[PDB]
Amino acid sequence: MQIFVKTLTGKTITLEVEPSDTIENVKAKIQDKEGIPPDQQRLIFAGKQLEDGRTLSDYNIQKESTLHLVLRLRG
Amino acid sequence: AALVIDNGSGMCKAGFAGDDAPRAVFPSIVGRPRHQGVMVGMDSYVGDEAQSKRGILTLKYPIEHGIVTNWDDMEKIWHHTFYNELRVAPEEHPVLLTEAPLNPKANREKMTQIMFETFNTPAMYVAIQAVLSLYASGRTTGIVMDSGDGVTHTVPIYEGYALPHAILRLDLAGRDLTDYLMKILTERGYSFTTTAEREIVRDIKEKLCYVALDFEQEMATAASSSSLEKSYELPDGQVITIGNERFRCPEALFQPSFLGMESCGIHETTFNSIMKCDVDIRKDLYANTVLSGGTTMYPGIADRMQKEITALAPSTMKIKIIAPPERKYSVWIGGSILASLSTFQQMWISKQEYDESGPSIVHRKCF
Amino acid sequence: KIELSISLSLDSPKLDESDFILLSVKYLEKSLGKKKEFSGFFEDIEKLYFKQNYKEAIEKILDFCKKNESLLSEQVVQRLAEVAPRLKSNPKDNESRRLYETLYADHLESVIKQESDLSVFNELRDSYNAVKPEYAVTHETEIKTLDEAKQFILSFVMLNDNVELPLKAQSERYPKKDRSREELGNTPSANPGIMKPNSPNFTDNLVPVRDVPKIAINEKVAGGYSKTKPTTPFVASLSGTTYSLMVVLTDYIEKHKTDKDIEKKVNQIINLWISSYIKEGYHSYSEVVDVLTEPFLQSIFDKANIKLNYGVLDDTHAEFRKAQDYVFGLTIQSAMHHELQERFKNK
Numbered sequence: 070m071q072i073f074v075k076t077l078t079g080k081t082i083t084l085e086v087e088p089s090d091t092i093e094n095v096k097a098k099i100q101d102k103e104g105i106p107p108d109q110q111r112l113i114f115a116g117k118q119l120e121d122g123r124t125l126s127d128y129n130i131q132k133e134s135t136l137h138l139v140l141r142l143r144g
Numbered sequence: 145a146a147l148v149i150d151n152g153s154g155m156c157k158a159g160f161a162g163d164d165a166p167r168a169v170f171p172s173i174v175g176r177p178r179h180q181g182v183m184v185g186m187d188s189y190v191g192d193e194a195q196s197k198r199g200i201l202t203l204k205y206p207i208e209h210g211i212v213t214n215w216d217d218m219e220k221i222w223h224h225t226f227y228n229e230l231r232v233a234p235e236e237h238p239v240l241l242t243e244a245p246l247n248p249k250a251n252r253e254k255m256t257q258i259m260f261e262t263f264n265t266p267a268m269y270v271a272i273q274a275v276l277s278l279y280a281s282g283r284t285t286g287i288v289m290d291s292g293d294g295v296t297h298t299v300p301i302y303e304g305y306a307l308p309h310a311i312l313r314l315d316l317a318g319r320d321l322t323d324y325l326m327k328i329l330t331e332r333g334y335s336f337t338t339t340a341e342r343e344i345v346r347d348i349k350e351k352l353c354y355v356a357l358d359f360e361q362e363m364a365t366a367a368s369s370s371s372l373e374k375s376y377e378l379p380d381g382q383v384i385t386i387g388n389e390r391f392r393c394p395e396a397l398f399q400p401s402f403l404g405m406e407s408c409g410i411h412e413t414t415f416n417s418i419m420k421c422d423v424d425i426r427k428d429l430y431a432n433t434v435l436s437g438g439t440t441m442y443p444g445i446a447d448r449m450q451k452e453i454t455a456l457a458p459s460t461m462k463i464k465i466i467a468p469p470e471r472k473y474s475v476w477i478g479g480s481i482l483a484s485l486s487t488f489q490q491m492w493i494s495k496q497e498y499d500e501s502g503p504s505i506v507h508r509k510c511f
Numbered sequence: 512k513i514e515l516s517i518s519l520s521l522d523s524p525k526l527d528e529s530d531f532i533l534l535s536v537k538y539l540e541k542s543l544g545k546k547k548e549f550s551g552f553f554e555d556i557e558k559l560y561f562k563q564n565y566k567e568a569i570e571k572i573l574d575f576c577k578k579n580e581s582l583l584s585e586q587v588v589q590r591l592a593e594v595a596p597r598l599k600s601n602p603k604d605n606e607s608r609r610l611y612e613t614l615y616a617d618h619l620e621s622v623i624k625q626e627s628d629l630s631v632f633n634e635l636r637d638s639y640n641a642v643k644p645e646y647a648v649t650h651e652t653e654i655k656t657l658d659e660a661k662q663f664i665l666s667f668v669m670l671n672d673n674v675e676l677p678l679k680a681q682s683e684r685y686p687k688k689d690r691s692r693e694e695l696g697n698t699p700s701a702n703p704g705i706m707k708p709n710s711p712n713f714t715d716n717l718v719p720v721r722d723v724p725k726i727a728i729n730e731k732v733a734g735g736y737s738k739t740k741p742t743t744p745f746v747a748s749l750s751g752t753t754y755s756l757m758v759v760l761t762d763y764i765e766k767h768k769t770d771k772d773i774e775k776k777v778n779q780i781i782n783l784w785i786s787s788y789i790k791e792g793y794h795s796y797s798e799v800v801d802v803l804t805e806p807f808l809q810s811i812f813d814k815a816n817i818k819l820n821y822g823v824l825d826d827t828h829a830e831f832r833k834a835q836d837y838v839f840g841l842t843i844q845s846a847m848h849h850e851l852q853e854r855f856k857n858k
């Protein structure tokens with residue numbers, strides 16, 4: 070299945086995923102496609118920050134669901 | 145001279161600080177008459193006498209799982225401790241009491257309340273048993289493995305403070321080991337079912353049982369030579385012989401399946417305990433596993449704990465099992481040691497401090 | 512007794528600036544009792560202590576101790592004055608202050624609970640529904656209880672690393688943050704608020720066991736906050752989220768400028784925010800207040816006629832007393848442990 074991750078600029082990265090895939094997994098897939106290190110990634114769906122251990126099912130993320138992506142700014 | 149009482153799940157160990165053994169060690173059980181009229185011409189029985197009159201009495205273990213549960217019977221145990229065993233008036237001696245790990249807040253307040261308002265002690269303190277056991281071995285940091293009569297605890301302690309978030313409790317200890325020994329000697333042919341026969345089987349356990357280094361070769365050696373068998377003489381003169389039973393019984397501590405328990409084993413709970421602690425302190429813990437209490441008293445137990453934790457821990461971890469020879473009563477001995485230190489004279493809860501703030505004071509002084 | 516206890520207590524190796532202040536005052540509240548005459552020295556030390564003004568207050572304590580020397584022990588003032596010039600603070604290890612601030616977070620929260628009618632948070636719903644990013648849910652329930660506003664106020668973290676970036680970037684204090692990036696995972700704890708998972712704690716002050724974040728200091732940051740303000744305990748450094756609170760408040764102030772009680776109501780937010788950030792272990796007091804007091808954020812309030820009290824309270828006596836007991840317990844245990852281990856050497 071397919072989902073869409075939207076960034077602050079409103080560009081959209083599309084990703085093929087299995088509902089079994091964890092968040093650690095989706096963040097790694099984003100790193101592979103775009104370079105973003107996952108410890109900087111913050112995935113948001115239904116207004117909640119998504120936690121790494123849980124899976125897409127556990128958040129009721131069906132096909133064509135949209136995630137939102139916010140990158141941490143630190144030093 | 146200050147008193148030291150270890151409030152134990154099956155044995156109360158009391159004595160005087162400065163001595164290096166408790167003077168009184170008696171079953172921590174209260175007996176009341178089963179039918180009226182065994183009362184005509186005399187009320188209740190405590191300790192060694194209440195086991196002697198088990199058949200005319202209804203026994204109650206007021207502290208069965210390490211946490212005192214019946215305060216009317218605890219009042220009577222402590223009264224028997226002060227007045228029959230030690231033969232002293234409590235108004236005349238500061239008194240150090242032990243408590244189990246994770247002891248509720250209120251259980252602590254009620255302990256203080258009784259000691260000041262029922263025994264009118266000048267001073268008192270409450271230390272955790274495991275901490276005292278660590279202190280008697282000169283450490284203030286390690287993980288203590290406390291295995292007594294009704295309860296075992298794995299208790300990490302960092303600079304004197306037992307860590308509530310990582311303390312593991314486990315309802316398998318000597319009472320359960322003594323019953324298993326009963327069961328398996330029965331399956332062999334020797335009938336032990338009566339409460340009087342339970343008492344001999346406890347003697348057989350503390351005199352002949354030991355921990356196998358590996359269970360399997362010991363079974364193999366039992367199955368292939370007489371070398372492990374030991375004769376035991378009963379009270380009526382009959383002699384019986386204990387074979388693999390000697391080590392099958394304490395084996396229950398590492399394999400609770402032997403009794404139907406789907407728990408872990410004193411080695412797994414130890415590791416589990418260590419792993420609820422911050423990574424930064426595990427090295428200290430792993431190098432100071434302190435064995436403590438009557439049920440750690442089996443020959444061979446230190447060496448198997450060494451082996452099993454080495455199998456659970458990372459491959460470079462330096463591991464030490466510390467099993468003192470005095471560890472049957474090292475709780476009490478650490479109590480005796482503590483009460484004696486002069487600096488400890490600044491840490492008693494005083495009669496003055498108590499009616500200034502009441503029983504809740506225990507929380508601000510004893511931690 | 513008390514002369515010999517504070518003697519032992521002062522022998523401790525790990526005694527910090529905040530330990531000394533509390534230990535000192537406990538001695539003078541017992542030695543000179545409640546003679547009114549010194550009532551205001553006690554009141555002033557507690558107020559300087561809260562403001563983390565240890566230098567002035569240690570100064571005031573020795574000097575008070577000289578000008579009352581005949582009233583005290585010369586043995587005890589010698590140890591006090593001899594130990595003072597060597598006293599430091601350690602942001603990794605400020606245990607007496609962690610417990611104080613955590614008890615204080617409760618006192619503050621309860622003061623707000625009988626002060627506020629909760630209208631400010633119902634009015635504030637709209638400023639959040641306006642400045643939130645699109646991925647943040649709107650708030651449409653009415654805020655009836657203080658926890659319901661506690662959870663609302665906290666949800667401003669949804670704005671982080673996006674909406675508040677314009678004014679984050681005007682700070683010269685915030686680049687000197689020194690939270691280490693290395694993700695360390697979660698450790699279980701039974702202490703509340705800002706306390707350390709492993710520190711001793713009163714057994715009526717425990718909280719149910721749950722996981723909390725380990726965070727490290729970088730220590731290689733030049734001018735880092737931990738280095739310049741070692742009095743404040745490190746929980747997570749400077750709070751970036753409070754720029755997120757400033758984006759919401761700016762909007763609120765703009766559209767309630769004519770409000771006559773505006774100053775009253777902004778202090779209920781700033782203060783409820785402060786209490787919750789300590790109580791929940793996100794940040795200690797100064798890690799929040801020292802981003803709020805930077806002069807470019809202070810304009811925002813000054814130009815609108817708002818004076819922030821910063822949760823400074825009438826008195827801190829209960830929480831200050833409780834902390835004395837704590838450091839009293841810990842430092843005598845230190846003494847007892849030293850007698851213990853020097854008795855095993857000799858065996």
Ligand SMILES: Nc1ncnc2c1ncn2[C@@H]1O[C@H](COP(=O)(O)OP(=O)(O)NP(=O)(O)O)[C@@H](O)[C@H]1O
Pocket residue numbers: 150151152153154155156210273290291292293294295317318319346349350351436437438439440441442443472475
């Ligand atoms: N080889 C042995 N030698 C001596 N005692 C033994 C031995 N094996 C078991 N014990 C048992 O060890 C238990 C002694 O319990 P004890 O350590 O006093 O526990 P407690 O009453 O729970 N007090 P505590 O350990 O301080 O919590 C009894 O069940 C004894 O039968």
